[PDB]
Amino acid sequence: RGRGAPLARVQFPNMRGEGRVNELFIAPEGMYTGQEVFSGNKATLHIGNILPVGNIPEGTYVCNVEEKPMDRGCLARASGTYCLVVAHNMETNKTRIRLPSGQKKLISSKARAMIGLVAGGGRTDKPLLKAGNAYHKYKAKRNCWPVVRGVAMNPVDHPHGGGNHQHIGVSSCVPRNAVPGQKVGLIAARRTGCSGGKRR
Amino acid sequence: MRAKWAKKRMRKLKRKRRHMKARSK
Amino acid sequence: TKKAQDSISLTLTLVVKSGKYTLGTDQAIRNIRDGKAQLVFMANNCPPLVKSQVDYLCHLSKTPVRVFAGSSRELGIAVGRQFNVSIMTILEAGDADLTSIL
Amino acid sequence: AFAVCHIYAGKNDTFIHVTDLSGRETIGRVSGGMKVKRHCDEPSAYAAMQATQDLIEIITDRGITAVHIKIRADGGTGKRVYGQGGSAAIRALVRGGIKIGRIEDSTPIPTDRTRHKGGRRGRRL
Amino acid sequence: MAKRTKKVGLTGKYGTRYGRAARKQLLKIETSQKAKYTCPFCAKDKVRRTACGIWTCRSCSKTMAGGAYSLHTEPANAARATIRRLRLARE
Amino acid sequence: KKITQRKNPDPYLKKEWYPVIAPAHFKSRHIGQTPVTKTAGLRVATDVINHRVYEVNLGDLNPGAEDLNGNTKFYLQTQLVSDGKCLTNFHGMDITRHKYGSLFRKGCDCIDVFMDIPTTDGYLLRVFVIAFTDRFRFQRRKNCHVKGRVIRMMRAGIYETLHNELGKVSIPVLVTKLSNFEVNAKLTEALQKITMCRDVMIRRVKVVKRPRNTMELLSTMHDSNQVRN
Amino acid sequence: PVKRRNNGRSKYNCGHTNIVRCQNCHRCVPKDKVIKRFTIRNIVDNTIADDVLNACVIQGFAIPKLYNKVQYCVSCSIHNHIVRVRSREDRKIRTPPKRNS
Amino acid sequence: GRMHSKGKGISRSAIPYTRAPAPWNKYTPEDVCEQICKLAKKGTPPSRIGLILRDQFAIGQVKNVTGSKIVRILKAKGLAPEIPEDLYCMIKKAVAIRKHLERSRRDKDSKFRLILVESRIHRLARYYRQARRLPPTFRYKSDQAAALLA
C-alpha cells in the first residue's frame, strides 16, 4: 500500500526444518513469477540473485544494498533506484558504491545486495494532475497532505506567522542549532535560489 | 551585417505589432 | 555464418512447399514417439519444461533436436504462419536437410 | 651528480627549476619574473639570463654537478612553441658550468583537445 | 471517426481542465500504460499492466515486474545487457 | 649528495641522499641520488622514498650502445629501501617525444594498436605499438597508402605477434625482450611478409595493475644476475 | 567574381570538412582553408646547439629536433607574412616559394 | 543511371552475336530442360540456375541451346516461382532492412534505404499486375511481407 515499488514473495527451503520459508523481497525489474533465484557466496550473476557485494562485478546496477553486513536490506530500495558498484579494495575488503543520491559510500564486501534496478521505475514522471490523485496517494502513507503554508497560519501557530500582508518577515535560512520549535525555514542552507551550473 | 540587423528590426516590430493586435483582439 | 542461416531458411521454405511438416507440441510428441519424425526444430521461447520433455523423447527415438534462433513467432515467420510455432517437426523434406545436424 | 631541470618557457614568465630525477623533491627554483619589475619583460631571455645565473649558485651549493634538460611551452591548447627564455635557459646553465645530460620536450600536447579561449571569430585584435 | 483532432485522444476525459503541458505528458504516459506489451515467455502481445510495477501476460498468466507505465524501462534494459555481458566475461 | 656531509640551504639543512639502483638486466645499475628530508614524527625517510618514480633513458641504463635506442626510456619505481639503497621495478617504458614526432609523415598510413596483456606473473600491462607504411621500390605513385585488406591483415598480424611473444611471459623476461628490442623486431618480420613497413616499434608499455608487495619479483628482477637466463 | 576557382578551399567531394584553429588568432577556420606548414627545427637555438652538444656528457647524443605543425587562418597568415598577397597571374602558381624545412 | 542512386556505372553482360549451341556442345535441348527442373526442385532462384549451367556445366546461354529462356522452361513444367524472382529478392531485402531497423530506431540512414527499396517494390509490382504475371489482388503489405516470402 505505502510503497510505489512491487514486493515479491519468494519461497526458499527451510534449512533448519522441513518447511519452505516465505520472504518478502523488493522486486528488481524483470523478476517473473516462476523465476528461480539463488542466494549466497556462490550465487550466479542474473537479475534477482542476492550475492555478496564484493562478488558482484564493477558496473552492475544493484538494489536493496546492505549498509553493514547482515542488516537484511538498507539502501536503494525505492522505485527505479539502483546502486552502482564502483570499486573493490582487495586489501581492505571494502567496496565503493554510488548510492541513488550520487554520494559514494564504502561498504564491506561481505554485505549482500540484489542484482537489478527496482521496478515501478519512471513513476515520478507521471504528473499527479489532480488534488484527488494526491489524496489517494498519501492515504496509503501518513497524514501529511493537505499542507498549509505557514505564512497563511496566525502568529501563534507558525514562526512565519501572520501580519497585515503574507510575508515571512525574516531570512528563511535558520541556524543548524535552532531549538525544536524554531527550525521551520530552510535549514543550514549553503546556497539558495535557482542558479544553474550547480555541478560545481 | 546590415541585412541581418534589418531583418532583426523587422522581426522585433512584427513581434510588437502582433502583441498589440492581441491586446485589442 | 549467414551463408548457413540462408540454408536453414531455404530448407524451411522448401519443406513448407514440398514435404510433410507438423506445427506444435501435441503433434510433435505424437510423431516423435512413433518415430515418424526425421528432424525436430524447436524455438528458443519453447517452455523450459516442454524443452526437457521433447529432448528426452527425441533421445529415445534418436531424432536430432535443434534450436531455431529464438521466438516461436520467428519460427512462425519461417514456416510462413502468423501464429506462433514453438516446435516444428520435419517428417519429410522436399529439399534434403544436410543441416539436419546443422 | 645527475638531476633534472624542468624549464617552463611558454610566454608571460619563464620558470627554471632543477629537481630530483623522481621530481618529488625540488633542489632549486627561480623565475624570470622575480628579476624584472616590468611585467612584459618577464618572458624575455635577459630576465631569464639573470634568473638562471641566480639558480646556479643555489643548485651547485647543493651538489647537482650535472643536470638533464626538459623544456616545455604553455602546451595544452596554447602556443606549442617554447618562446623567448627557453633558448637562454640552456645557454646560461652552459655559462655556469652545469653539464648537460639529455634534452627533451615536456610540452603537455593534447590528443583530441578540449576547446580553447577565443571564440570562432577569434581574438579580434 | 477522428472524433478528437489533436492529441486529446486519451486526454479528452480531462476536459478543458489541467492545462496543455500536463495533458501532453499524460498523453504519452497513459498511452503506454494502457497498451499491450509483448510477453517475454508467451510471445503474444497480451501483457497488460495490473498495477504500477506489475505487468501480467493474459495468455501465460505469468506476472512480471516492470516499470510503472511501461513493461521495460530503458535503464533496466541497459543493466540487463550490462549484466549479461559482464557475466559472460566472468565466464 | 651534499647536505648529509656539510652545509646546504634551510630545507636541505637536515636532508639525506640515498643511492638508487636499477634492475639486473641493465648495464649501469646506479640511476642516481634522491634528496629526502631526515626522519620525522611519522615521516620516516625510507618510507617517504618507498614509491618515487625515476625516468631513465635506455642509453643511460645500458651505456655503450647509445646510438641504438637512444629514444627508448624506462620509468622505474622503487619497491624496497634495503641497504640504504632504493631497489626499483619496471613500471613503464615510452619512446622519446622527439622520435614520436619523426615517426609520422604525409603519404603514409599509421597503425597503432593497444593490447593489454596479463603476464605469466601478477603484473597486467598494456602494450601500445605503432607501425607505418613505406614506399615500395617501384612506386609509380608518391603515396605509401594501402587498401583496407592490408590494413586489417597488418593489424590482425600485430596482435598475433604479441599473442605468441609478450602474451605469456613474466616481467623479467619482458624487460629483456623490450630492451634487446626483440618483440619490436618480431612484429617487423611478420609485417615484412604482409607489406612494405617502417617504424614497427612498441612505443609505450604501461603497468595497468601491480600485484601487491612484488618484493619476491624485485629479488628476481634485481639480484637474479646469476639467473640471467 | 570568383577570385579563386578553388574558392580558397582545397575541398573536393566533401560537402563539410573538419575544423582547425589559428595558432595566434585562435579563430575557427575550415581545415581546407588553413595555411598548414610543417616545421622541423632544433630544440635548442641552432647558434647554441654546438656548445650544448659538446657540453652534453652523453656520447653521440644528437640534439633532439622539435617536430610540430603550425596552422594559421588567412587573416592571421597575411599579417604574419606566412603567405603574401600575389598578382592575379602569380596566384595560379601552386609551388612553394624558393623551394618542408 | 540507377533509379535511386546517382551512379552512372555500366557493367552489362553482352550476349554473343551468333545465337548457336557451342561447337563443343554435346547435350540435347530436353537434356538441359530436365537438368533445369532438377535445380528448380532444389529451389535455386532462376538467375542462379543459369549461373550453375554456365559454370558447373558449360551451356553459356540457355536460349542458344534449348531455344527458350530459363523462366519460360520453368513455366512449361509449372515449376515457376509464384512471385517473379526479381520482386522476391527486393521483398526479402526489405524484410531484413525492416528487422534491423526494428532493433535500432536511431539508424536514420537505414530508414532512407527502406523507403527506396519499398518504392522499387511498389513500382515493379504495378508492372507485374498490369502484365497479369501477378494477380490484380496483389498489394504490398509490409506486415505480411515475411509471410509472403513463404
Added chain:
RNA sequence: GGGGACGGGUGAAACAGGAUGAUCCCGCCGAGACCGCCGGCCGCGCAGGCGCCUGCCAAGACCGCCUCUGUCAAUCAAGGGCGAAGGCCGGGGGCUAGAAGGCGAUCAGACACCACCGUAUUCCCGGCCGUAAACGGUGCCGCCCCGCGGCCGGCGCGCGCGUCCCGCCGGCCGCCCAGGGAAACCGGGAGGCUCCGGGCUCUGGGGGGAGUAUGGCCGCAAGGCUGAAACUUGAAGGCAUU
C-alpha cells in the same frame, strides 16, 4: 610530498590568485567532453554530414560476367521522409568553451573590440523547429563532345617482375584547343544555340514600398510557408578599364 616569492594576463596594463605556502615540480584520484600529429586537388554519403579501440547489425555505389527479367523507364503538383547550427520542450549530465550578466583596462564617450569571471548552451536521450553564403551561388535524366596531366576503386592485356607497362569502366580533380559569353571566366560546359526545337520540373520580368500589410495554413513559442496594393523614383545592378 617538495621548495620558497611572486603569479596571471597583455599591445601595454588592470581586476580576480600568493606565507590559509600560490605559480612551479612529481605521483595519485574524480569528472565530463574530444578523437591530435598521419589528414589530402584522399575517399564515402541523398543532401545535411562523416576520423579512438574491439566487436555487432543491416546496407551502398563501382567493377567483372555468354546470369535472370523483358520496358518494368524519365522528370515530377499534391503527398511522405531527411535536414548544419542556434532555438525550444520534457528527462539526464556538466570538464571545457561560452550569447546574457558582471567586472578591468582603453576612449571625449566604449556600456565594443583586448583581459578576467561567468548563466543558458555545447554533450546524451525522447520529441519540436524546418532554416544557412544549405553554394559548385550552376535542377534532373539523354547524346555528341581535344588534347594533356595527376588521384581513387574494380578489371583486363603484355612482359622481367614489378604494388612495371598499356588500356577499359565508374568516379574526384587541374590545364586548355575549338566553341561560347557583356566580360570575369566555362570548357567532363556556362560548348555543340539569332544557322535559335531531346525530354521534364522549378523560378525570374527596372529600383524601392516590402518579404511589409492582410488573409490562410503550420509551430509550444521563436517564427516558417504562402503573399500584396496604394504610392514613390530615373535609375538600381553585373563584369571589366583607367
